[PDB]
Design a protein around this ligand. Structure first.
Ligand SMILES: CCCCCCCCCCCCCCCCCC(=O)OC[C@H](CO[C@@H]1O[C@H](CO[C@H]2O[C@H](CO)[C@H](O)[C@H](O)[C@H]2O)[C@H](O)[C@H](O)[C@H]1O)OC(=O)CCCCCCCCCCCCCCCCC
Ligand code: CLA
Ligand code: CLA
Ligand code: CLA
Ligand code: CLA
Ligand code: CLA
Ligand code: CLA
Ligand code: CLA
Ligand code: CLA
Ligand SMILES: CC1=CCCC(C)(C)[C@H]1/C=C/C(C)=C/C=C/C(C)=C/C=C/C=C(C)/C=C/C=C(C)/C=C/C1=C(C)CCCC1(C)C
Ligand code: SF4
Lengths: 107, 32, 41, 80, 31, 733, 163, 61
C-alpha cells in the first residue's frame, strides 16, 4: 500500500544516478508503470527464487524456439499441403492453445 | 461623439449587404 | 570462418562495434576523470 | 492541351510509345538513327501529362520532354 | 467632441473617393 | 476571350474550377497575358501604383478619423501614463450583458478596443491636442488620395499616356527621388518640427491661423544668413523640462544633446529637427549627381563599365549590367524589396531602443506590437526579394550579353556559394542546438554548474567602445583618456553617456550567456533562409537533375516521378520552403526580444540570464506564465477583458492546424474522393435537377501548397499576435 | 575582473550554489540507515560533488553574478589573462580529433578507389586496409600540407557542373 | 573517327557525365547525327550507364 514499484537501477556514472528515486524498502531506482509486481502477487510468487527460475526457464525455452526456427526452415520444412490444413489448425489452436492453456492456468 | 447611430446603419450594410451583392454580381461574372 | 568475417565487415556491424568502442571508452574516461569542463589538469 | 516534342537524340527504342496510356506517341520511320526509327506525337490533344514517356527514355537526357500546357476535358482526364 | 456636422462632410468626401476608384478600376480593367 | 480570366485564353477555356482559382492568382502577373506589349505593361503598373498609393492614404484617414471620432484623445493627452488610448468601438450584434460591459474599458461610453497600434503617440509627439486637429488632418488624406485616383484615371488615356522610354529614364528618377522626394520632404519636415512640433512641445499653440504671426525663434534669419549658426543651438532645454508646457523651457531650435528627454524618456525634438535638416542637405546635394537634359552629370552605364578591375578577377566586371537592370523589372524589384526590407527591420532595431515618440517605453505593449510588426513585415519582403531574384534568372536574364559579367561569374560557381552556406548553416546547427541540449541535461540532473556558458565577449567590447562602463574595458568612449571621448566630450557625449548607463531605457541592454546562445540561432536562421533562397535563384536556370527549368516555366509542380521522382524541383517550390524558415528566424527573434524585455519591464534581470541558457526556461518560464492570463479570457466563470484574445489565440491554432491538411495530404487522394461525390450528387434524386457549370476538381498541386502556406502563416501570426499583446496587456510589464 | 566577472573561487553565489546542493542531498540520505547502500551511494555523490567545486574554484574559472562559470573565446583574452583551457586549448584538441577521422576517411576512399568495383568495397570494409589508413592518418596536419602544396589534395577542374 | 575502348572526356552541357571520363563501347562509320556510344561506370539518375554522343562533343584523353 506504500512502496512504489521499481526494477530498473541506474549506474552512477555521468551524474545520472539522480534518476534513482527514493521509493521504498530502502531502495533507489526507477518507478515501474508496467505492472509486473501486481501480476506477480496474483500468481502467488513471493521469493526472488521463483523469478530467477522464470528468467532462466524463460530464457531457456527461448533458445528452444530459435532451434525450432532453424529446424523448420533449413532442416525439416513442411510442404504446402501441411499449411493448407485449416480445420486441423483450427481444431488445435482453439482447443490446444486456448482450451488447454486455460485449464492449465485454472490449475 | 454625437453620431452614435451610424455603426448600426453601416456595419450591417458593410458586413452583410455589400458581401451579399458582391457575392451575387461577382458570381454572375464568372460565367458569360 | 571465411564468410563469418566478411559479414562482420559489413557497414552496420562495424558501425555498431566501433561506436560501442568509442562509447564505452568515452564513458569510462568520465569514470576515472569525472566532470571535465576545461582542460586544466 | 499539353505540348510534347521530340528531339534528334532518339534511339527509336519504342519504349515511349509502349508507355502512353492514351497512345499519343507513334513511331515514324527515319534515316539517321541506328535503327532508323523516330517517335512522334500526332496527338497533343490526348497527352494527359503522365510523363510516363520521360521515365522510359533510355537516352541520357531525354528525347521527349512533355511541356504541360492548359488542361481540357480530355487532358484533365475527367469522367465527369 | 467632433461636431456631428463635420462627420457627414467627411463621409460624403470619402464617398467621392469611392467613385474615382470605380472610374479608375473600370478604365484600368477595360484597359 | 469571354469568360472570367479575360487575360489568358488557356484559362479562359477550362471546364473545371481551376479556371476560377488561377483566374484570381494569375491576375497581377502582367508579363503573362494575351498580348502584353512592352509599352502597355508599364502602363498598368504605373496606374496600379496610384492604386496602392491611394489605398494607403484612405487607410490612414481611417485611423485618424476613428480616433478623432470613436476614440478618446483629449482625455489621454491630459494623462498619457494613467489612461489607455482607444480605437474604434465594438459593435457586434452578438454579445451578452457582460461582454459589452467588460469591453467598455476606456473613457468612452461603449465597448472599445484599447489601441495597441502605437499611432496614437506619434500624433502627440508631433503634437495635436484636439480631436479637431485629427479630423482636420483626416480630411486631407481623403482629399489627397482622391488626387491620385484622378491621376490614375488621368494617365491611362491616349493623350496623357506616357511613352515607354519615359519609364526607362533612370537618371531622371534618381535625381528627382533623391532631391525632390527624399530631400525636399526632409526640409518640409523640419519646417513642421520647428514651426509646429517644437514650439507646441513647449506649450505654444500654433495652427494654420496663427502660423505666421509667431516666430519659431527669437532671432530672425539674421543668424542663418549672416552665417552665424550657433544661436539656434545656443540655449537648449533644461533637464527638468516638462513636456507640452513651459517650465524652464530652453529657447533653442536646432541642437543635439544626445540621450533622451527625461520627462518623456524619448528623444529630444531639437535633436530630430537638427537630424532631418542635415539629411535634407545631403540628399539635395546627392540628387544632382546623375545627368539629365542639361548634359552635366553622370551616365549610369559609363560609371559602371569602367569598374572592371584591372586584373580580371571579375573578368568583364560590370558590363552591360545597365542593360539587364534597366530592362528587367524583376531585377529592379528584387533590389527594392531587399533594400526596403532590411530598413523595415532597421526601423524595428532602432525604434524600441531609441524611442523617438513621447511617452512610449512607458506604455510597453505598444512597443511589442510594433517591433514584431516591422520584423515580420521585414521578413516577407526579403523572401520576396529573392523570389523576384529567381524570376529574374528564370526569365529576363540573358547569358549572352552578360558573358563574363559579374552575374555570370556567380552562375559560374553555383556550388561554392551553395556549399559554404551549407557548412555555416550546419556549424550553427549542431553546435547551437548541441549546447542547448547539453545545458538542458546538466540542469536536469540538477547541477547547472556543469553547463556550457560562453560570455559574449565581442558585443561586450563593442558596448565598451560605445562606452558602457559596466564592463572592465575602457577603450574609446569608455576611457576618458582615448582620443574619442576627448573629441565628442563637448557635444553629444554628456547626454548620450547618461542614457546608456541608466539601465532603465533599453538602449544597449546588458548581454550575457543566454544572449550569446540566441544570437547564433538567429544567425542560423539567416543562413538557412538564404541557403534556400540563394539556391532557388542559382538553380532556377538548371541543375544536374532537370536542366530544362529555364524553359519549363517558373512555378511548375514537378518533372514527374522519373529518373528518381522529381518533386519540388522548381524555383517556386524552393521559395515556398523559405517561408517556413522565415517564420522561425523571426519567431526566435520576436521571442528573444520579448522575454528579455519582460524581465526588464517587470524589474528583474534574473528571469532571463539565469533560465535563458537551457531550453526549458523558454517553455517553463516564458510560455507557462504568459499563457495563464490569456486562457482565462473565455473562462466559464466570466469574461475577462482579454477574452478577445483568448478566442483568437484558439483561432490562431485552428488555422495553423488546418494548414497541415494542405501541406501533408497531396492531391491524388482528394481527386478520387471528389469523383465519388460528383457521382453521388449526380445520381441522387432531387439533386439531378441542380448541376454545376464548372466541373469540380481537386485543386492544382502548386495551388494547395500556396493555400497551405497561407494557413500556416495566418495561424502562425495570430497566435503570437495574441500571446504577445495579451501577455503585456494582462501583466503590463 | 575580466568583463565584470570574478574568479569562481572568490565568488559567493557559486559558494551558495555548491553548499545548497549538499544540504538537499544530505537531508535526503537521512532517510536511509547506514546499513543501506542508498546511504552509501548518496554519501559518495556528496563527496564526489564537493571534489569538483574545489576543482572549479582552484582552476580559476570566472563566475558572473549567477555563480555559474563562464568561458572566454578570444585568444588575446584567454591567453594573456591566463585561462585558455576553456576553448583555446581544446579547440586545438578537437581539430586534431576531427581532422584525424576526417583525413582517415579520404585515404580509405583513395585506397579503395582503383579496383574492379569500388562500390562493394564501401559497403563491406576490409578492416586491415582501414587499419592501415587509421594508422597512416596520424600527423595529418603535416600530410595535409603536402597534399596541399604538391597539388594532390584537390581534384582540380574535371569536376562536373550544370549549365 | 574515334576508336573503341579508348578513354574520353565529354563536354556536352546537359548530361550527368559532363566533364567525366568514359570508355567508348562502339563508334559507327555512318552519317548518324550521334554515332559514338560511350559507357560509364557511374550511374545516371535514370539508372542509365550508357549514352550516344556527337563527334563535336566527345574528346579523347
Ligand atoms: C493578399 C490577399 C488579399 C487580402 C486577403 C484576402 C483574402 C485572401 C483570399 C484568397 C483569394 C485568392 C486565393 C488564391 C488561391 C489561388 C492560388 C493559386 O492557385 O495560385 C497559384 C498560382 C499558379 O501559378 C501560376 O499558374 C499559372 C497557371 O497557368 C496559367 O497561366 C499560364 C501563364 O500565362 C497560361 O496562361 C496558361 O494558360 C494558364 O494555365 C502559370 O503556371 C503561372 O506561371 C504560375 O505562376 O501561382 C502563382 O502564380 C503564385 C502567386 C502567389 C504568390 C504569393 C504567394 C505568397 C504566399 C502568401 C504568403 C503567406 C501570406 C500569409 C499572410 C498572413 C498574414 C495575414
Ligand atoms: C495442440 C496443438 C497445437 C498447439 C498448442 C499449437 C500452438 C501454437 N501454434 Mg500451431 N499448429 C498445430 C497445432 C498446435 N499449435 C497444427 C496441427 C498445425 C498444422 C496446421 C499448426 C500450424 C501452425 C502455424 C502455421 C502456426 C502455428 C502457430 C502456433 C502458435 C500460436 C502463436 C502464438 O501466439 O503462440 C503463443 C505461444 C505460446 C503461448 C508459447 C507456447 C509455445 C510452446 C512451445 C508450445 C508449443 C506446442 C506445439 C504444439 C508444438 C509441440 C510439438 C513440438 C514440441 C514437437 C502456438 C505456439 C503460429 C506460430 O507461432 O508459428 C510458429 C503459426 O504461424 N501453428
Ligand atoms: C488442470 C490443471 C490441474 C492440475 C494439474 C491439477 C492437479 C492436481 N489436483 Mg486439481 N483441480 C483442477 C485442476 C487441476 N488439478 C480443477 C480445475 C479443479 C476444480 C474442480 C481441481 C480440484 C481439485 C481438488 C478438489 C483436489 C485436486 C487435487 C489435485 C492434486 C492431486 C490430483 C491427483 O491425485 O491426480 C491423480 C494424478 C494434483 C496436484 C487434490 C489435492 O490437492 O490433493 C489433496 C484435491 O483434493 N484438484
Ligand atoms: C555539441 C555541443 C557539446 C559540447 C561542446 C559538449 C562538451 C562536453 N560535454 Mg556534452 N552533451 C552534448 C553536447 C555537447 N557536449 C549533448 C548534445 C548532450 C546530450 C546528449 C550532452 C550531454 C553531456 C553529459 C551528460 C555530459 C557532457 C559532458 C561534456 C564535457 C566532457 C567532455 C569529456 O568527456 O571530456 C573529454 C574526454 C576525453 C578527452 C576523452 C578522450 C581521450 C583520448 C584517448 C585522448 C587521446 C589524445 C591522443 C564536454 C565539455 C560531461 C561533463 O562533465 O560536462 C560537464 C557529462 O557528464 N555532455
Ligand atoms: C520632385 C519630383 C518628384 C517627386 C516628388 C516624385 C514622387 C514620386 N514618384 Mg516620381 N518621377 C519624377 C519626379 C518625381 N517623383 C520624374 C521626373 C520621373 C520621370 C523619370 C518620375 C517617374 C516615376 C515613376 C515611373 C514612378 C514614380 C513614383 C513616384 C512615387 C513613389 C512612391 C512614394 O512616394 O514613396 C513613398 C516613400 C517616401 C515618401 C519616402 C520613403 C523614404 C524611405 C523609404 C523611408 C524614409 C521615411 C522614414 C525614414 C520613415 C518614417 C515615415 C513616417 C511616417 C514615420 C512618388 C509619389 C512611382 C509611383 O508611386 O507611381 C506614382 C512610380 O511608379 N515616379
Ligand atoms: C511590392 C512588392 C511586390 C510586387 C509588386 C510583386 C509582384 C508580383 N509577384 Mg511577388 N512577392 C512579394 C512582393 C511583391 N510581388 C513578396 C514580398 C513575396 C514573398 C511573400 C512575393 C512572392 C512571390 C511569388 C512566390 C510569386 C510572386 C509573383 C508575382 C507576380 C504576380 C503576382 C500575382 O499573380 O499575384 C496575384 C494575386 C494573388 C496571388 C493574391 C493571392 C493572395 C495571397 C496568397 C495571400 C493570401 C493570404 C491572406 C493575406 C490571408 C488573409 C488573412 C485573413 C483571412 C485573416 C507579380 C509580378 C508570382 C509570379 O510572378 O509568378 C510568375 C509568383 O509566383 N511573388
Ligand atoms: C525542428 C525541426 C527541424 C530541424 C531540426 C531541421 C534541421 C535542418 N534543416 Mg529543416 N525544415 C524543417 C524543420 C526542421 N529542420 C521544416 C518544418 C521545413 C519546412 C519544409 C524545413 C525545411 C528545410 C529546408 C528547405 C532546408 C532545411 C535545412 C536544414 C538543415 C539546416 C542545418 C542545421 O541546422 O543542421 C542542424 C542539424 C541538426 C540539429 C540535426 C540534429 C540531429 C542530431 C545532431 C543527430 C541525430 C541525433 C541522434 C544521434 C539520432 C539517434 C537516432 C537513433 C536511431 C539512434 C538541418 C538538417 C537546410 C539544409 O539542407 O541544410 C544543409 C535546407 O536546405 N530544412
Ligand atoms: C572576429 C575576430 C576577432 C575579434 C573581433 C577579436 C577581438 C579582440 N581581440 Mg582577438 N584574435 C582573434 C580574433 C578576434 N579577436 C584571432 C583569430 C587571434 C589569433 C590568435 C586573435 C589574437 C588576439 C591577441 C593576441 C590579442 C587580441 C585582442 C583582442 C581585443 C582587441 C582589442 C579590442 O577589441 O578591445 C580589447 C578588448 C577588451 C578590453 C575587452 C576584454 C574582454 C574580456 C577580457 C573577455 C578584442 C577583444 C587583444 C586583447 O587581448 O585585447 C585586450 C590582444 O592582445 N586578439
Ligand atoms: C570520411 C569521409 C568524409 C569526408 C572527408 C567529408 C568531408 C567534408 N564533408 Mg562530408 N559527409 C560524409 C563523409 C565525409 N565528409 C558522410 C558519410 C556524410 C553523410 C552520409 C557527409 C555529409 C556531408 C554534408 C551534408 C556536408 C558535408 C560537408 C563536408 C565538407 C565540410 C566538412 C564538414 O563540415 O563536414 C561536416 C560533416 C558532417 C555534417 C557529417 C559527417 C559525419 C561523419 C564525418 C561521416 C562518417 C565518416 C566515415 C564513417 C569515415 C569512415 C572511415 C573508415 C572508412 C576508414 C568536407 C569536404 C559539408 C560541405 O560540403 O561543406 C563544404 C556539407 O554540407 N558532408
Ligand atoms: C538573388 C537576387 C536576384 C537577381 C538580382 C538581385 C540583385 C535581386 C539578387 C539579390 C537579391 C538580394 C536581396 C541580395 C542581398 C540582400 C541583403 C541581405 C542585403 C544586405 C546587405 C548588408 C550590407 C551591405 C551591410 C554593410 C555594412 C554595414 C551596413 C555597416 C557599416 C558600418 C559598421 C559595421 C559599423 C558602423 C559604422 C559603419 C562603417 C557604417
Ligand atoms: S523517345 Fe526515348 S524511348 Fe521513345 S524512341 Fe526515342 S529514344 Fe526510344
Amino acid at each position: 500500500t506504500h512502496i512504489k514499484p521499481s526494477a530498473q537501477v541506474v549506474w552512477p556514472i555521468v551524474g545520472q544516478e539522480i534518476l534513482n528515486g527514493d521509493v521504498g524498502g530502502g531502495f533507489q531506482g526507477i518507478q515501474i508503470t508496467s505492472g509486473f509486481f501486481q501480476l506477480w502477487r496474483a500468481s502467488g510468487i513471493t521469493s526472488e527464487l521463483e523469478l530467477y527460475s522464470t528468467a532462466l526457464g524463460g530464457l531457456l525455452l527461448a533458445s528452444a524456439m530459435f532451434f525450432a526456427g532453424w529446424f523448420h526452415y533449413h532442416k525439416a520444412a513442411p510442404k504446402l499441403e501441411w499449411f493448407q490444413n485449416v480445420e486441423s489448425m483450427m481444431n488445435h489452436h482453439l482447443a490446444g492453445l486456448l482450451g488447454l492453456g486455460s485449464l492449465g492456468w485454472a490449475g | 461623439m454625437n453620431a452614435a447611430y451610424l455603426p448600426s446603419i453601416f456595419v450591417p450594410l458593410v458586413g452583410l449587404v455589400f458581401p451579399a451583392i458582391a457575392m451575387a454580381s461577382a458570381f454572375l461574372y464568372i460565367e458569360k | 570462418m571465411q564468410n563469418l568475417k566478411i559479414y562482420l565487415s559489413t557497414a552496420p556491424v562495424i558501425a555498431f562495434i566501433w561506436l560501442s568502442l568509442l562509447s564505452s571508452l568515452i564513458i569510462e574516461v568520465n569514470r576515472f576523470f569525472p566532470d571535465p569542463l576545461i582542460f586544466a589538469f | 492541351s499539353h505540348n510534347v516534342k521530340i528531339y534528334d537524340t532518339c534511339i527509336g527504342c519504342t519504349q515511349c510509345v509502349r508507355a502512353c496510356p492514351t497512345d499519343v506517341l507513334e513511331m515514324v520511320p527515319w534515316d539517321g538513327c541506328k535503327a532508323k526509327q523516330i517517335a512522334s506525337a500526332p496527338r497533343t490533344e490526348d497527352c494527359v501529362g503522365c510523363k510516363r514517356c520521360e521515365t522510359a527514355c533510355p537516352t541520357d537526357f531525354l528525347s521527349v520532354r512533355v511541356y504541360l500546357g492548359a488542361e481540357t476535358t480530355r487532358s484533365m482526364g475527367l469522367a465527369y | 467632441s467632433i461636431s456631428e456636422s463635420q462627420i457627414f462632410i467627411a463621409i460624403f468626401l470619402a464617398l467621392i473617393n469611392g467613385f474615382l476608384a470605380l472610374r479608375l478600376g473600370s478604365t484600368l480593367y477595360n484597359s | 476571350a469571354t469568360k472570367f480570366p479575360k487575360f489568358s485564353q488557356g484559362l479562359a477555356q477550362d471546364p473545371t474550377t481551376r479556371r476560377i482559382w488561377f483566374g484570381v492568382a494569375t491576375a497581377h502577373d502582367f508579363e503573362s497575358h494575351d498580348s502584353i506589349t512592352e509599352e502597355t505593361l508599364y502602363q498598368k503598373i504605373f496606374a496600379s501604383h496610384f492604386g496602392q498609393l491611394s489605398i494607403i492614404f484612405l487607410w490612414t484617414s481611417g485611423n485618424l478619423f476613428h480616433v478623432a471620432w470613436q476614440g478618446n484623445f483629449e482625455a489621454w493627452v491630459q494623462d498619457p501614463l494613467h489612461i489607455r488610448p482607444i480605437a474604434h468601438a465594438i459593435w457586434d450584434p452578438h454579445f451578452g450583458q457582460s461582454a459589452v460591459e467588460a469591453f467598455t474599458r476606456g473613457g468612452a461610453s461603449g465597448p472599445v478596443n484599447i489601441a495597441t497600434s502605437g499611432v496614437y503617440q506619434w500624433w502627440y509627439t508631433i503634437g495635436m491636442r484636439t480631436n479637431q486637429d485629427l479630423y482636420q488632418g483626416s480630411v486631407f488624406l481623403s482629399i489627397a488620395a482622391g488626387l491620385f485616383l484622378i491621376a490614375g484615371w488621368l494617365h491611362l488615356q491616349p493623350k496623357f499616356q506616357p511613352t515607354l522610354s519615359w519609364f526607362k529614364n533612370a537618371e531622371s528618377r534618381l535625381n528627382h527621388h533623391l532631391a525632390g522626394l527624399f530631400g525636399v520632404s526632409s526640409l518640409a519636415w523640419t519646417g513642421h518640427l520647428v514651426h509646429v512640433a517644437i514650439p507646441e512641445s513647449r506649450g505654444i499653440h500654433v495652427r494654420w491661423d496663427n502660423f505666421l504671426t509667431i516666430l519659431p525663434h527669437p532671432l530672425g534669419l539674421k543668424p542663418f544668413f549672416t552665417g552665424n549658426w550657433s544661436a539656434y543651438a545656443q540655449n537648449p532645454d533644461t533637464i527638468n523640462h516638462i513636456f507640452s508646457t513651459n517650465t524652464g523651457s530652453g529657447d533653442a531650435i536646432l541642437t543635439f544633446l544626445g540621450g533622451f528627454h527625461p520627462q518623456t524618456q524619448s528623444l529630444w525634438l531639437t535633436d530630430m529637427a537638427h537630424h532631418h535638416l542635415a539629411i535634407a542637405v545631403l540628399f539635395i546635394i546627392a540628387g544632382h549627381m546623375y545627368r539629365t537634359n542639361f548634359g552635366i552629370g553622370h551616365s549610369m552605364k559609363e560609371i559602371l563599365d569602367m569598374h572592371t578591375p584591372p586584373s580580371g578577377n571579375l573578368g568583364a566586371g560590370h558590363q552591360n549590367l545597365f542593360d539587364t537592370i534597366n530592362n528587367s523589372l524583376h531585377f529592379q524589384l528584387g533590389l527594392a524589396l531587399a533594400s526596403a526590407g532590411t530598413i523595415c527591420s532597421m526601423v524595428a532595431q532602432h525604434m524600441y531602443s531609441l524611442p523617438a515618440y513621447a511617452f512610449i517605453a512607458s506604455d510597453f505593449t505598444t512597443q511589442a506590437s510594433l517591433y514584431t510588426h516591422h520584423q515580420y513585415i521585414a521578413g516577407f519582403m526579403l523572401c520576396g526579394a529573392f523570389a523576384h531574384g529567381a524570376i529574374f534568372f528564370i526569365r529576363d536574364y540573358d547569358p549572352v550579353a552578360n558573358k563574363g559579367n559579374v552575374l555570370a561569374r556567380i552562375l559560374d560557381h553555383k556550388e561554392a556559394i551553395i556549399s559554404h552556406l551549407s557548412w555555416v548553416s550546419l556549424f550553427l546547427g549542431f553546435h547551437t542546438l548541441g549546447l542547448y541540449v547539453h545545458n538542458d541535461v546538466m540542469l536536469a540532473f540538477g547541477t547547472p554548474e556543469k553547463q556550457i556558458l560562453i560570455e559574449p565577449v565581442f558585443a561586450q567590447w563593442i558596448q565598451a567602445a560605445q562606452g558602457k562602463s559596466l564592463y572592465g574595458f575602457d577603450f574609446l568612449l569608455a576611457s576618458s583618456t582615448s582620443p574619442a571621448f576627448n573629441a565628442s566630450q563637448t557635444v553629444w557625449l554628456p547626454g548620450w553617456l547618461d542614457a546608456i548607463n541608466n539601465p532603465t531605457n533599453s538602449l544597449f541592454l546588458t548581454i550575457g550567456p543566454g544572449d550569446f546562445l540566441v544570437h547564433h540561432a538567429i544567425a542560423l536562421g539567416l543562413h538557412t533562409t538564404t541557403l534556400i533562397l540563394v539556391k532557388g535563384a542559382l538553380d532556377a536556370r538548371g541543375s544536374k537533375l532537370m536542366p530544362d527549368k529555364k524553359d519549363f516555366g517558373y512555378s511548375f509542380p514537378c518533372d514527374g516521378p522519373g529518373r528518381g521522382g522529381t518533386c519540388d524541383i522548381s524555383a517556386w517550390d524552393a521559395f515556398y520552403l523559405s517561408v517556413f524558415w522565415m517564420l522561425n528566424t523571426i519567431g526566435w527573434v520576436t521571442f528573444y526580444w520579448h522575454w528579455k524585455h519582460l524581465g526588464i519591464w517587470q524589474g528583474n534581470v534574473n528571469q532571463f540570464n539565469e533560465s535563458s541558457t537551457y531550453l526549458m526556461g523558454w517553455l517553463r518560464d516564458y510560455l507557462w506564465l504568459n499563457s495563464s492570463q490569456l486562457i482565462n479570457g473565455y473562462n466559464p466563470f466570466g469574461m475577462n477583458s482579454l477574452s478577445v484574445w483568448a478566442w483568437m489565440f484558439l483561432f490562431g491554432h485552428l488555422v495553423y492546424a488546418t494548414g497541415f491538411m494542405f501541406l501533408i495530404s497531396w492531391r491524388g487522394y482528394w481527386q478520387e474522393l471528389i469523383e465519388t461525390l460528383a457521382w453521388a450528387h449526380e445520381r441522387t434524386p432531387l439533386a439531378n435537377l441542380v448541376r454545376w457549370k464548372d466541373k469540380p476538381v481537386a485543386l492544382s498541386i502548386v495551388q494547395a501548397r500556396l493555400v497551405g502556406l497561407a494557413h500556416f502563416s495566418v495561424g502562425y501570426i495570430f497566435t503570437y499576435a495574441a500571446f504577445l499583446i495579451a501577455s503585456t496587456s494582462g501583466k503590463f510589464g | 575582473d575580466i568583463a565584470g566577472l570574478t574568479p569562481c573561487s572568490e565568488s559567493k553565489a557559486f559558494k551558495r550554489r555548491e553548499n545548497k546542493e549538499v544540504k538537499s542531498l544530505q537531508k535526503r540520505m537521512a532517510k536511509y540507515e547506514e546499513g543501506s547502500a542508498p546511504a552509501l551511494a548518496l554519501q559518495a555523490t556528496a563527496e564526489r560533488t564537493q571534489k569538483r567545486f574545489e576543482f572549479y574554484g582552484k582552476s580559476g574559472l570566472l563566475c558572473g553574478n549567477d555563480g555559474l562559470p563562464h568561458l572566454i573565446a578570444d585568444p588575446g583574452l584567454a591567453f594573456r589573462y591566463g585561462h585558455a583551457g576553456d576553448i583555446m586549448i581544446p579547440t586545438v584538441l578537437f581539430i586534431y580529433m576531427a581532422g584525424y577521422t576526417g583525413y582517415a576517411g579520404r585515404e580509405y576512399l583513395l585506397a579503395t578507389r582503383g579496383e574492379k568495383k569500388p562500390t562493394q568495397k564501401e559497403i563491406i570494409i576490409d578492416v586491415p586496409l582501414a587499419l592501415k589508413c587509421v594508422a597512416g592518418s596520424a600527423g595529418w596536419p603535416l600530410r595535409a600540407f603536402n597534399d596541399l602544396r604538391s597539388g594532390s589534395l584537390l581534384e582540380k577542374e574535371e569536376n562536373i557542373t550544370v549549365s | 573517327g574515334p576508336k573503341r575502348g579508348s578513354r574520353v572526356k565529354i563536354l556536352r552541357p546537359e548530361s550527368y557525365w559532363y566533364n567525366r571520363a568514359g570508355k567508348v563501347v562502339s563508334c559507327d562509320q555512318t552519317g548518324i547525327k550521334y554515332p559514338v556510344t560511350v559507357r560509364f561506370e557511374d550511374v545516371n539518375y535514370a539508372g542509365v550507364s550508357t549514352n550516344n554522343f556527337g563527334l563535336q562533343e566527345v574528346e579523347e584523353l
